[PDB]
Amino acid sequence: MLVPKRVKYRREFRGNMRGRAKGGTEVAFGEYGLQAVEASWITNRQIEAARIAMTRYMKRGGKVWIKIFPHKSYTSKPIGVRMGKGKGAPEGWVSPVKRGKIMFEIAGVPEDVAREALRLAAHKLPVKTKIVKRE
Amino acid sequence: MNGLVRAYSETADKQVFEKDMLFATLETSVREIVLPDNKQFLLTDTVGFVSKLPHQLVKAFRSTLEEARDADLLIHVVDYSDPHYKTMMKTTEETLKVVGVEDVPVIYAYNKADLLEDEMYPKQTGNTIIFSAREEESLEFLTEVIRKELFASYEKATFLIPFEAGQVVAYLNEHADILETEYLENGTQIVAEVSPADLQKLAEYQVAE
Amino acid sequence: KVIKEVKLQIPAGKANPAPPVGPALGQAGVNIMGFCKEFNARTADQAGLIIPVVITVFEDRSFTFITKTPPAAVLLKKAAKVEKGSGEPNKTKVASVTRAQVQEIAETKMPDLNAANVESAMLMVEGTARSMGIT
Amino acid sequence: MSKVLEAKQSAVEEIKTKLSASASTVIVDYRGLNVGEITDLRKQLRDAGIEFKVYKNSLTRRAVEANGYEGLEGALTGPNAIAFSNEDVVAPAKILNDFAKDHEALEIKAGVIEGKVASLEEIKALATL
Amino acid sequence: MKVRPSVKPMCEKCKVIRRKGKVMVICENPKHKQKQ
RNA sequence: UAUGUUAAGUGGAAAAGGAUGUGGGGUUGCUUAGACAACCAGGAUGUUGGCUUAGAAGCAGCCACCAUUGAAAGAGUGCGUA
Ligand SMILES: [Mg+2]
Ligand SMILES: [Zn+2]
């Protein structure tokens, strides 16, 4: 699973996800891509599952791109611990995706199997998506 | 199991896992085997075992060893290239007794006999086999071993199928090993071997010489 | 007359009580004389190879032995000199036949085939020639 | 439409020239008959050059509109297979009657022998002679 | 009959209709009958 | 008061997902030289194409998938016979 090799600080703020995507709002590498319509956090587990289900249908033919990466980390507390006494220990890694950001790319396959592969990927992500193509 | 399936199964695309990691297969899979003489049986694989397995987990595998619990022929694949093979074999028997598999015809099959230098495989002594499961001779050898063990009531009996009545020529080709067939003016003459169920199912068609 | 006229192609000349000469007329009381000797009598000079014979049976047992022509299936074997047909078709050719050899076979069967144009009728042999794979 | 009309227009005039060139034009109702049954008559007529054809009803009447036909207005109905006979008018006329006795499905009534549209009653005399 | 919120055709002979104000699939194969 | 929408008591509770509910715009094929739907008729010949099979004739499986009568008919779209 995609994790950073090392980080400067182990703890980070939750942040916010308001506004349009700063960059990457268009397809540049492949010819089809999944575009987010809403905004939500995407963990690294959902990136992996949406990728195996995406290359398995393509039978390992053609190249896919991952346009997002889980830079930020989040923490959690055990059950039975009261509030306070510091901060929790990190658990996973997330990538806050604002609306209008392409998350995947497809090239090297015909029209029929490009849309179907993207369709199976979208069902594993918690955001409402749309299949978009280049020009 | 993969070698046997590739050898005989119609759906040869249907394969099984195969890797060197501990506990590669954790779920049982059933496959249907069709020997060339039109004989049918099933072949199942199970998860493996290790020494001093916790007793909590054997209670859970009591379910996963149901297929071997109610079986007809067992094969106890013992490695023959690891010096502690005697210990591993015996451990297998104690684990099986814990599950509740007993009074079962066991056929031992020592594998990996290619690695051992200057050994005669395939062979057979008592109920013990020496073979490597990567060649087209050991596999077929074990197939006629299973043929000897399972099917031993397939007595031969001639038949005279009425010429008009079809659907019996076809049945006595996919459920028997037809030795010879003949054509007469009053029907067709069939000589083959069938299960004792068929001796009473189709008793009238037989004709005595 | 002729209650049933199920066509029964069989091994003409050396006919035997085989399924090709069996259940085809086995519902109409086919006799060995009316199945083997009847074809043997008709195929005096047509014996040796297998040629079709269409028969008709009335309410009373009637042997209407009408042997068909030496079809292009047997003809394609002698012209191409292949005992076993080449199933490879376009993948490969087991053998080949002379271009003039096909004309002799086509000319012989020309009266049987209902094609006004002899040149067109020779083109139909190419499909039979391509059917066996070997030219 | 332009592709459709051009093909339709060209084919329509072909019948009119053929009808003008034909010394006797006939048709029979090809309904309830074997595919090869007509072929038996067609093959015999093929050696005599009396082959026929069938087209759409609207196109069939288009040629007759401008081919000097004044009695074929009511003949553009049902399964129409116009037969052109410019070489042997008597032979094609008796060809139809030969199959009509053998097969009752062929009640040929169209007749343009000598360019004149004889009625279905007078066609039978033409068919039998 | 399969009662699920995701009724959709499975084969080429399936058909989608509406009876009593709900979506259902009727097919010649009885295993394909679904209702929402 | 004027112009429209809803048939769900939605109005007056709640998502991913599913759908020939309904109204409004756009892009288009075919058609009175006759469009879709129905009814009538046809729907064939070499030929049971080759290989494999006890058995493979369009329809167990793989290979090219022709010419012929004709305006149409596929070396056959689904049933069925071992
Ligand atoms: Mg395993
Ligand atoms: Zn269905």
Instruction: Decide: CB of B170 under 7 A of nucleic strand F.
Output: yes
Q: What is the CA D69 to chain-centroid distance, rounded?
A: 13
Instruction: Decide: CB of E36 under 7 A of nucleic strand F.
Output: yes
Task: Give the span between the Cα atoms of B157 and B176, in whole angstroms.
Answer: 11
Contacts of A89 (CB under 8 A, 6+ apart): A75, A76
Q: Which nucleotide has the least CA–C1' distance to B167?
A: F82
Task: Write the DSSP assignment of C15-70 as a string of letters.
Answer: --SSGGGTHHHHTTT--HIIIIIHHHHH-SSS-SS-EEEE--B-SS-----EE---
C114 CB near a chain D CB, below 8 Å? yes
Sign of the four-CA dihedral B63, B69, B72, B74:
positive
Count CA atoms closer than 13 A to A38's CA, side-chain side.
8
CB atoms within 10 A of CB A110: 8
Q: What is the resolution of this structure in A?
A: 3.1
* Residue at minimum CA to C1' distance from nucleotide F69: D39
Count CA atoms closer than 13 A to B78's CA, side-chain side.
23
Q: What is the CATH number of domain B1-150?
A: 3.40.50.300
Instruction: Decide: CB of B166 under 7 A of nucleic strand F.
Output: yes
Residue B171 (CA) to nucleotide F53 (C1'), in angstroms, measures 15
Chain D: closest CA distance from residue C116 (Å): 7
Give the gyration radius of chain B's Cα atoms. Answer: 21
What's the gap in Å between E32 CA and the centre of ligand 2? 5
Calculate helix-pair angle for D2-21, D57-66, nearest 10 degrees: 50
CB atoms within 10 A of CB D111: 27
Mark the nucleotides of strand F covered by protein, meaning any atom under 7 Å from a CB: 8, 16-21, 30-34, 40-52, 54-55, 61-73, 75, 81-82
Is E14 marked as binding a ligand?
A: yes
Q: Per the annotation, where are the binding residues of B for GTP?
A: 45-48, 111-114, 132-134
Angle formed at CA B19 by CA B15 and CA B22, multiple of 5 degrees: 125
D46 CB near a chain C CB, below 8 Å? yes
The candidate with the shortest Cα–Cα distance to B193, out of B181, B205, B176, B180, is: B176
B163 CB near a chain C CB, below 8 Å? yes
Main-chain dihedrals φ then ψ at residue A104, nearest 5 degrees: -150, 165
Is residue D47 classed as helix, strand or coil in its secondary structure? Answer: helix
Token pair of B177 as six digits: 């090993």
Terminal alpha carbon distance of chain B: 44
D114 CB near a chain C CB, below 8 Å? no
Task: Give the span between the Cα atoms of A23 and A60, in whole angstroms.
Answer: 29
Angle formed at CA D34 by CA D74 and CA C70, multiple of 5 degrees: 150
Instruction: Decide: CB of D125 under 7 A of nucleic strand F.
Output: no
Q: With CB atoms and an 8 Å threshold, state whether B163 touches C22.
A: yes
C116 CB near a chain D CB, below 8 Å? yes
Place of tokens 């360019």: D115
Chain D interface disruption, residue of C110, C112, C114, most D CBs within 10 A: C114
* Domain ranges for chain B: 1-150
The candidate with the shortest Cα–Cα distance to C49, out of C66, C64, C68, C63, is: C68
Chains C and D touch (3+ CB pairs under 8 A): yes
Task: Write the DSSP assignment of B99-165 as a string of letters.
Answer: HT--S--EEEEEE-TTTSSS---SEEETTEEE--TTSTTHHHHHHHHHHHHH-----EEEEEE-SS-
Contacts of C8 (CB under 8 A, 6+ apart): C20, C21, C24, C25, C52, C53, C54, C55
B183 CB near a chain C CB, below 8 Å? yes
Q: Which residues of E1-36 are buried (b: 16+ CB within 10 A; e: fewer)?
A: eeeeeebeeeeeebeeeeeeeeebbebeeeebbbee
Chain B residue numbers with beta carbons less than 8 Å from the beta carbon of C22 are 163, 183
Token pair of C94 as six digits: 């087991």
DSSP-derived letter for residue D110 is E
Instruction: Decide: CB of D33 under 7 A of nucleic strand F.
Output: yes
What's the gap in Å between C124 CA and the centre of ligand 1? 57
Q: Which nucleotide has the least CA–C1' distance to B170?
A: F82
Residue C81 gets the label, from left (phi > 0), alpha (psi -120 to 50) or beta, of left
Is residue B56 classed as helix, strand or coil in its secondary structure? Answer: helix
What's the gap in Å between E21 CA and the centre of ligand 2? 21
Query: Is the Cβ–Cβ distance between C82 and C134 less than 8 Å?
Result: yes
Q: Which nucleotide has the least CA–C1' distance to C75?
A: F46
Q: With CB atoms and an 8 Å threshold, state whether D46 touches C116.
A: yes
Sign of the four-CA dihedral B61, B62, B63, B69:
positive
Token pair of D26 as six digits: 């006939």
Main-chain dihedrals φ then ψ at residue B190, nearest 5 degrees: -120, 135
Task: Give the span between the Cα atoms of D122 and D118, in whole angstroms.
Answer: 6
What's the gap in Å between E34 CA and the centre of ligand 2? 10
Query: Is the Cβ–Cβ distance between C21 and C36 less than 8 Å?
Result: yes
Ligand nearest to the CA of B20: 1
Query: Is the Cβ–Cβ distance between C44 and C34 less than 8 Å?
Result: no
Q: With CB atoms and an 8 Å threshold, state whether C27 touches B185.
A: no
